[PDB]
């Protein structure tokens, strides 16, 4: 019954809002990973807070976050490696703590809070994103004005690489899920930010 | 915690038992039970009917391998109306068509010929209400509406053209909210779900609108070399839990 | 010493009597299975009773059955999947109980008595064929006349399919063994049906 | 029951021990023992000879890797006369040739370079009498008959041209009646058989007609892509159980 | 005894723990500890310094994934100066540069994206002194000599052009004398070594000449079909044991 | 401290002294193994004693052996199979005991003292070479004159073969290590046979 329960829900938020089509969320939703010899390339980045990126908002969590003016809670983002069994490769997923910028660097990114993904070692890896805040609660919609609002950024990078026997696809997808941790709360409900009625009825 | 890698689940095994059938698959999914419930038999307090129900457990409750569908690199999913599909086949179906009221949970097994390579996990879900809807002329003016044939897919479990079209209007992304057992197929592609359900409507004939629809729609594209096999079938087997029916009467497919 | 012991013997009966060559039983003996996209195609069929098909008779069991006018006993037919490890695919082997016809249908066939084969799951699967009879014993040679004689039919079908990485053969074989169950008996011995001497000697 | 899938047997292991040799193979077959017997040493009651036999156990009883033969997609099998093959090699063979009477069971290991892919199981069998026969001119008039060289293949274990030709006149199908350990090679291709045997003839010199012939003839064709290796050797190693010989005398190959 | 097959080691696992980091890899190497020692903290008797050292254990002692280098079929190895490489990164490095004396053992993990296929084992070794040398004009007359930059590779761990050039003058063959954990990569390519070391020089600033150099040079060429992937990265992560430093002063990279 | 400790050392001796280049010991060091249909071909041979072949001497053991006029001890030679996982094949490594010649025959070679290698069964196999001697100690440098000196020969041969899915390399390498057994001793130290100074200094 509680909205929070909905927040937990597995349902998937797209890594970054990239709209090949408005109609299909899918295109953004899956993020390609491919064999690339270069070292520390940026897989993807999104503002961690669900509101900003949008795909989060599209997700249940994002939607709910829109509902409540303030949310506090650790958010969890799971990533699933859709590639083939034969494939292997290692990735880095980092939360850049507020006060930092997006690292734009493998080294810079790595230090923050990160996990190292090992493909074949683990098909899926779980990133975790802590609640770090000056203020006890944060506001939902982050305008230019409110720093206190701002959660931070998430970025994915290639730790090692992506590698596959030829006979196997060069390219693969990763799918992103996200949820809220057990302790996650919202406040200051507002009129439905999540959905605005196209028209009201008499 | 669950093994991170596998969509899985199950290397280990799964066994489904029902009357006059047992199925075991090495390439199986660990069972996920709906809403943490398990299918039960309607309580006396629960039941209005005042007719002694017939619970042919074994013949009725058992393994039907209703259909196989081959899977392409990507395919439009089809989803399977619960009541009808069994209905076509006996014994259950004959009784189901025969008898006005059908209510029961069932255990579902979906299996593919095991392939390691397979990727591009497919979403499987059951939805109680699943209430279909149309583009409505795509203007939205049209206000259009159901086939009877569509309503009763029968065994076939007629496919949904578009994944959000799957029922209803629910985006692939959002759909996850209703829980799925995905088959990544990255591991063995099998899913097991038992969906005990407490139905919204206290009773549904299911002679008509189906109690559940079981949906299968691929999240991620299968991707693969020229190098290896283009095809793998996906087959679904399900066995209902002990159902309750009332209204003996004559037989109607309806 | 007992003939029945011979009956048990593993030795192989061909699925269906198909004679590429009379000389080599082998050609019929192995039954091809290949990747086929179609769903519920008929792998093979033979009259379950050893006498009719012939390859059974060629086998020890068939030979012995020829010996005895009457046989009762559960017959067992094992099938072995000779294809490559990489390959996988699922099959349906059904006994169609007497009074039925050959199903000529996946659905019809399946219901009867069947097992589902999972390749890779199991290289080999064992079908079992019960003794179901109006009469306590059945006669060996089944002419048009005698229904009571008739055992029934066995048919193999594709449950799922056959699938293999290319780099692997499209086509594969299955080999059929057959035996008699522990309880299997014969009666009314006759002059050697199994073998007739080309010529008698003074 | 036995694992259905494998012709196998053995992922697990097999170890054969003999004097001054031990062989272990991961890719092995579980041992199948002939007729549920195990090779023994001739009883006093059993033995006529009245000469104290010599039972060099270790040197004699041990591992000989007599031969390897590569296997093509399909190949004509060869079968291996028991007495001669060892005979060529020492120590056993020298004694065997030397000594008039040889009788013993032996343990046989056949192994291939392990290949998962291999299919088309090959039949391996031992036959006591194995009594060879000819087409006889194919009219049947001819009434034709043995080579000495054929009779004593020596180590080589001269091949049989045709699988039923394998001894004698016994169709591939029917041959199964004599039990086989098949190597499907679908799993690891290895076979282990111990054939303790009670011989038909109470004594065979085996100086002459061989006590046993070990046969290898493929049931199912190897099938495989251009994609992977055309070749895999098959090697056979056998170690006799403690043999009994009598008649010390001079040495003759005979 | 150790499993013959694997260069390995480790299918099973390895876990390295350090402050504010834990790393586990399924594809890991069993740890080999240098000279059967384990890194310790300098004894009072041992230590001249008379300043209370600072032992930030966690922040300092933990996992740095300093670098990844992709591996070609064959590649010239690079070797990694211990002190500098960490030095570049913090926290350890900042302190290291800051503080005059650094001495400590560290645990090293080298991992590649796991590939079964990989072959052509690569030698990994740590050498205490590693004292580099030049061709000297290749006449030998030249008498030539170090870069500063070479001396302090920094994090990068500048590569050695030639495998014997690796330090010093030590042939690939002979090099084995200093023990290696090879990564055949035939199995999973991972190595774990803990090198507790008692240093030759009772103290090395390591501000300057590095205490150790970690070398990676392939013994056997990677060989592989057109058929599968041309690339696999090799990454090295190391965590130092609790170090000892003295001389607080100002900060100098030096 | 003891030289013997050095003797133990893993460091690698080349199978046979084949100098593609003097400069790089490597070329000899790794010995090719390739898929070959022929049966019992000679992989390689070297005089077992470290001195003669040379690559041994280059190794620590060989070097030390040069040091001491007499050595007695079981030598151990490990062989490592660098080929790919997919590959498999079986080999024969034989010590031919003194008084024998190099067998130059699969059969002759095999009987001696041998092990059968199974690839895939074992990536690596360990050969062992016993100390068999008329005399309690043997001299280091083996001239034409001294039989008593001579240790014997080692030879490698193909037991089965080398086999690999295409998609896998035809050819592979094996690397040879060698060491001295726990009981290994040397005597009669001489001026450094191992190294001679190019020039002495005043």
Residue A6 φ then ψ, to 5°? -65, -35
Distance CA(A10)–CA(D37), nearest Å, equals: 62
| Residue where the block lists tokens 């079938």 | B233
| Residue where the block lists tokens 């001119």 | D137
Distance CA(F59)–CA(B14), nearest Å, equals: 57
Task: Please give, rounded to a whole number of angstroms, the shortest distance from the CA of B22 to a CA of chain A.
Answer: 30
CA F71 and chain centroid, separation: 16
Distance CA(D29)–CA(D111), nearest Å, equals: 8
Distance CA(D109)–CA(F107), nearest Å, equals: 18
Distance CA(B83)–CA(C106), nearest Å, equals: 21
Q: In this structure, what DSSP letter does residue F100 have?
A: B
Task: Please give, rounded to a whole number of angstroms, the shortest distance from the CA of D225 to a CA of chain C.
Answer: 5
> Interface of chain B against chain A, CB under 8 Å?
4-7, 116-121, 171-177, 179-180, 184, 186-187, 219-221, 223-225, 227-228
Method of structure determination: cryo-EM
**Considering only CA atoms, which of C124, C129, C52 is closest in space to residue D220?**
C124
Distance CA(F66)–CA(F57), nearest Å, equals: 7
Joined tokens for residue A106: 């493998």
C-chain residues near B114 (CB < 8 A): 88, 118, 120-121
CA C189 and chain centroid, separation: 23
Q: Which residue of A has its CA nearest to E113?
A: A89
**Considering only CA atoms, which of F139, F137, F162 is closest in space to residue F149?**
F139
The DSSP line for E79-109 is EEEHHHHHHHSTTHHHHHHHSS--B--EEEE
Contacts 24+ apart (CB under 8 A), E24-27: E25/A118, E25/A121, E25/E109, E25/E111, E25/E190, E26/A118, E26/A121, E26/A122, E26/E114, E26/E188, E27/A118, E27/A120, E27/A121, E27/E111, E27/E112, E27/E114, E27/E188, E27/E189, E27/E190
Q: In this structure, what DSSP letter does residue F107 have?
A: H
Residue B83 φ then ψ, to 5°? -65, -40
Partners of F45 in the β-ladder: F155
CB E6: neighbour CB atoms within 10 A? 18
User: A180: Cβ–Cβ under 8 A, 6 or more apart, which residues?
Assistant: A4, A7, A8, A61, A73, A74, A75, A76
Smallest Cβ–Cβ distance between B220 and the set A30, A60, A85 belongs to: A30
E-chain residues near A37 (CB < 8 A): 70, 231
Smallest Cβ–Cβ distance between D229 and the set F107, F159, F166 belongs to: F166
**Considering only CA atoms, which of B221, B228, B213 is closest in space to residue B185?**
B221
Please give the helix or strand (H or E) that residue B96 lies within, else none.
helix B92-98
C-chain residues near D6 (CB < 8 A): 123
Distance CA(B120)–CA(D139), nearest Å, equals: 65
- E-only strand ranges, D13-162: 14-18, 21-25, 31-33, 64-71, 79-81, 106-112, 122-127
Q: Judge: F160–D231 Cβ closer than 8 Å, yes or no.
A: no
Alpha helices in chain F (DSSP H): 3-8, 26-29, 50-53, 55-58, 60-67, 106-111
Distance CA(F60)–CA(F66), nearest Å, equals: 10
Partners of F51 in the β-ladder: none
Please give the helix or strand (H or E) that residue D136 lies within, else none.
none
The DSSP line for A70-128 is EEEEEEEEEEEE-S-SS-B-EEEEEEE-BTB----SHHHHHHSEEEEEETTT-S-EEEE
**Considering only CA atoms, which of C136, C152, C147 is closest in space to residue C77?**
C152
Identify whether the C-beta of residue B225 lies closer than 8 Å to the C-beta of residue A168. Answer: yes
Identify whether the C-beta of residue D197 lies closer than 8 Å to the C-beta of residue D16. Answer: no
Residue E61 φ then ψ, to 5°? -85, 100
Residue from E124, E125, E173 whose CB has the most chain F CBs within 10 Å, to mutate: E173
Q: Judge: A167–E228 Cβ closer than 8 Å, yes or no.
A: yes
Q: CA distances (Å), B196 to each of A5, B33, B106, B212, in order?
A: 21, 7, 7, 11
Distance CA(C160)–CA(B235), nearest Å, equals: 7
| Pairing mode of beta strands D181-183, D79-81 | unpaired
User: C158: Cβ–Cβ under 8 A, 6 or more apart, which residues?
Assistant: C33, C36, C38, C39, C40, C41, C43, C89, C90, C91, C92
Distance CA(B29)–CA(B12), nearest Å, equals: 9
Distance CA(E120)–CA(E65), nearest Å, equals: 24
Smallest Cβ–Cβ distance between A120 and the set E23, E70, E114 belongs to: E114
Alpha helices in chain C (DSSP H): 3-8, 26-29, 50-53, 55-58, 60-67, 106-111
Distance CA(E51)–CA(F183), nearest Å, equals: 49
Smallest Cβ–Cβ distance between C82 and the set D121, D175, D225 belongs to: D121
Joined tokens for residue D66: 């007599």
D-chain residues near C122 (CB < 8 A): 4-5
**Considering only CA atoms, which of E217, E214, E181, E175 is closest in space to residue E32?**
E181
Q: Judge: B114–C89 Cβ closer than 8 Å, yes or no.
A: no
Three-state SS sequence of A24-70: CCHHHHCEEEECCCCCCCEEEEEECCHHHHCHHHHCHHHHHHHHEEE
Partners of B48 in the β-ladder: none
> Interface of chain A against chain B, CB under 8 Å?
6, 9-14, 25-26, 29-30, 55, 58-60, 80-86, 121-126, 166-169, 171-173, 175, 177
Burial F23-50 (b: 16+ CB within 10 A, else e): ebbbebbbbebbbeeebbeebbbbbbbb
Distance CA(D160)–CA(B240), nearest Å, equals: 58
Residue F74 φ then ψ, to 5°? -75, 135
Alpha helices in D156-217 (DSSP H): 172-175
Joined tokens for residue C194: 């199994």
Q: Which residue of B has its CA nearest to A118?
A: B5
Identify whether the C-beta of residue F192 lies closer than 8 Å to the C-beta of residue F144. Answer: no
B-chain residues near A124 (CB < 8 A): 4-5
Residue from E27, E93, E231, E239 whose CB has the most chain A CBs within 10 Å, to mutate: E231
Distance CA(F153)–CA(F95), nearest Å, equals: 6
Resolution (A): 6.1
Smallest Cβ–Cβ distance between C37 and the set B70, B90, B114 belongs to: B70
In a 13 Å sphere around the CA of F85, the CA atoms on its Cβ side amount to: 15
Distance CA(E106)–CA(E194), nearest Å, equals: 6
Task: Please give, rounded to a whole number of angstroms, the shortest distance from the CA of F112 to a CA of chain D.
Answer: 11
Please give the helix or strand (H or E) that residue D87 lies within, else none.
helix D82-88
Distance CA(C129)–CA(C95), nearest Å, equals: 6
Q: Which residue of F has its CA nearest to E4?
A: F124
Distance CA(A114)–CA(A156), nearest Å, equals: 10
Q: CA distances (Å), B56 to each of B20, B45, B247, C81, in order?
A: 12, 21, 15, 37
A-chain residues near E69 (CB < 8 A): 39
A-chain residues near E10 (CB < 8 A): none
Overall size of chain C counted in residues: 202
Identify whether the C-beta of residue B104 lies closer than 8 Å to the C-beta of residue B244. Answer: yes
Please give the helix or strand (H or E) that residue F117 lies within, else none.
strand F113-118
Three-state SS sequence of E103-131: ECCEEEEEEECCCCCCCCCEEEEEECCCC
Q: Judge: F173–E186 Cβ closer than 8 Å, yes or no.
A: no
Q: CA distances (Å), A158 to each of A38, A119, A163, A165, F120, in order?
A: 9, 11, 12, 19, 33
Joined tokens for residue B45: 């307090």
Taking CA E77 as the corner, what is the angle to CA E73 and CA E78, rounded to the nearest 5 degrees?
140
Q: CA distances (Å), C106 to each of B237, C111, E226, in order?
A: 15, 9, 44
Q: CA distances (Å), E205 to each of B32, D113, E108, E242, E246, in order?
A: 60, 56, 21, 16, 9
Smallest Cβ–Cβ distance between C175 and the set D6, D117, D220 belongs to: D220
Identify whether the C-beta of residue D190 lies closer than 8 Å to the C-beta of residue D25. Answer: yes
User: E127: Cβ–Cβ under 8 A, 6 or more apart, which residues?
Assistant: E167, E178, E212, E213, E215
Identify whether the C-beta of residue D190 lies closer than 8 Å to the C-beta of residue D112. Answer: yes
Q: Judge: B176–A177 Cβ closer than 8 Å, yes or no.
A: yes
Identify whether the C-beta of residue D116 lies closer than 8 Å to the C-beta of residue D27. Answer: no
Joined tokens for residue C91: 């099959």
Count residue pairs from A and E with Cβ separation < 8 A.
72
D-chain residues near C85 (CB < 8 A): 116-117, 186-187
SS3 for E76?
Answer: coil
Count residue pairs from E and F with Cβ separation < 8 A.
102
Q: CA distances (Å), F122 to each of D114, E4, E7, E187, in order?
A: 11, 6, 11, 12
Joined tokens for residue F83: 């080929």
D-chain residues near C172 (CB < 8 A): 119, 223
Query: Neighbouring chains of F at 3+ CB pairs within 8 Å?
Result: D, E
The DSSP line for E180-196 is -EEE--SS--EEEEEE-
Overall size of chain A counted in residues: 202
Smallest Cβ–Cβ distance between E173 and the set F25, F124, F168 belongs to: F25
B-chain residues near A53 (CB < 8 A): none
**Considering only CA atoms, which of D129, C40, A144 is closest in space to residue B70?**
C40
Residue from F3, F9, F11, F62 whose CB has the most chain E CBs within 10 Å, to mutate: F11
Q: CA distances (Å), E247 to each of D109, E54, E104, F31, in order?
A: 71, 10, 16, 53
Distance CA(F13)–CA(F64), nearest Å, equals: 13
Query: Neighbouring chains of B at 3+ CB pairs within 8 Å?
Result: A, C
Joined tokens for residue E200: 């030759």
């Amino acid at each position: 019954r509680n909205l929070l329960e909905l927040c937990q829900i597995d349902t998937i938020m797209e890594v970054n809002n990239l709209t090949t089509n408005e109609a299909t969320p899918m295109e953004r939703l899956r993020i390609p990973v491919q064999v690339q010899t270069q070292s520390g390339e940026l897989c993807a980045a999104f503002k961690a807070d669900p509101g900003l990126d949008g795909p989060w908002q599209s997700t249940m969590v994002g939607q709910l976050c829109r509902y409540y003016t303030q949310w506090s809670g650790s958010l969890k983002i799971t990533f699933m490696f859709t590639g083939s069994f034969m494939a292997t490769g290692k990735m880095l997923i980092a939360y850049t703590p507020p006060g930092g910028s997006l690292p734009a660097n493998r080294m810079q990114a790595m230090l923050g809070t990160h996990v190292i993904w090992d493909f074949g070692l683990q098909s899926s890896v779980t990133l975790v994103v802590p609640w770090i805040s000056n203020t006890h609660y944060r506001s939902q919609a982050t305008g230019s004005f409110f720093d206190y609002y701002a959660t931070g950024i998430v970025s994915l990078w290639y730790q090692t690489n992506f590698v596959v026997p030829i006979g196997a696809p060069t390219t693969a997808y990763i799918v992103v899920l996200g949820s809220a941790q057990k302790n996650f709360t919202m406040r200051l409900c507002r009129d439905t930010s999540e959905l605005t009625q196209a028209a009201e009825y008499q | 915690s669950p093994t991170a890698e596998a969509c899985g689940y199950s290397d280990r095994v799964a066994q489904l038992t029902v009357g006059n059938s047992t199925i075991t698959t090495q390439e199986a999914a660990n069972v996920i039970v709906a809403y943490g419930e398990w299918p039960q038999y309607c309580p006396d307090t629960d039941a209005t009917a005042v007719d002694k129900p017939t619970r042919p457990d074994v013949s009725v409750n058992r393994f039907y391998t209703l259909d196989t569908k081959d899977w392409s690199s990507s395919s439009k999913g089809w989803y399977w109306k619960f009541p009808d599909i069994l209905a076509e086949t006996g014994v259950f179906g004959q009784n189901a068509q025969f008898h006005f009221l059908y209510r029961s949970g069932f255990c579902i097994h979906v299996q593919c010929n095991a392939s390691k390579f397979h990727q591009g996990a497919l979403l499987v879900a059951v939805l109680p209400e699943y209430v279909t809807g149309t583009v409505s002329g795509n203007t939205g003016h049209e206000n259009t509406h159901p086939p009877y044939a569509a309503t009763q897919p029968g065994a076939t479990g007629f496919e949904l053209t578009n994944p959000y079209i799957l029922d209803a209007g629910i985006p692939l992304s959002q759909l996850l909210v209703c829980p799925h057992q995905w088959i990544n197929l990255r591991t063995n592609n099998c899913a097991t779900i038992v969906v005990p359900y407490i139905n919204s409507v206290p009773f549904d004939s299911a002679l008509n609108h189906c109690n559940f629809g079981l949906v299968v729609i691929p999240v991620s594209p299968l991707g693969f070399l020229q190098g290896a096999t283009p095809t793998i079938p996906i087959t679904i087997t399900v066995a209902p839990m002990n159902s309750e029916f009332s209204g003996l009467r004559q037989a109607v497919t309806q």
